Task: inverse folding
């Protein structure tokens, strides 16, 4: 699947994370690492908005670049995982 | 009510998790966390039988203790919730 800034949060779920548990430790730990790293970086990308010493311009720029790096990392983990036959869950709007 | 292995599925639902967004935040956050943590753990406990590197004795032992723990979580979640006036279905 294609990770974007819009759909990140709806794909990087504990469910999709739990699917990684079938890979051998050799392949599983680095993928779990990229996944949890992207998620930590994504969920922190807006924190400069609340930092009073940062301008709105810089906080918006940083937010944008942190998200794009987290998206890149999640794409890397998903792509590594799909080559091993893992199929992640899409977001089905009518289920929420 | 009081949570057990058989009743966990019937109680921890989206409907019941829906009733919790109405809560005031200081109460709303930890009870949503406990609830969500319980569900995720109840489910992960089933992947123990998928691990071919686990003896069936070990996989069953871990399955119970994980379930048991998820039951503790959902119980207090429900304790902490009903104390704020949320009726759940039996």
Result:
């Amino acid at each position: 699947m294609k990770i974007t800034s819009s759909n990140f949060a709806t794909i990087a779920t504990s469910e999709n994370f739990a699917k990684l548990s079938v890979l051998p430790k050799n392949h599983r730990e680095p993928i779990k690492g990229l996944f949890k790293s992207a998620v930590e970086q994504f969920s922190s990308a807006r924190d400069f908005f609340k930092n009073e010493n940062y301008s709105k311009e810089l906080a918006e720029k940083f937010n944008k670049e942190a998200v794009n790096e987290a998206v890149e990392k999640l794409q890397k983990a998903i792509d590594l995982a799909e080559k091993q036959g893992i199929q992640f869950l899409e977001h089905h709007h009518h289920h929420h």
User: Anything to note?
Assistant: Chain A touches chain B at residues 14, 18, 21-22 (CB under 8 Å). Residues 56-82 of chain A form the longest helix (27 residues). Residues 25-87 of chain A form one domain.
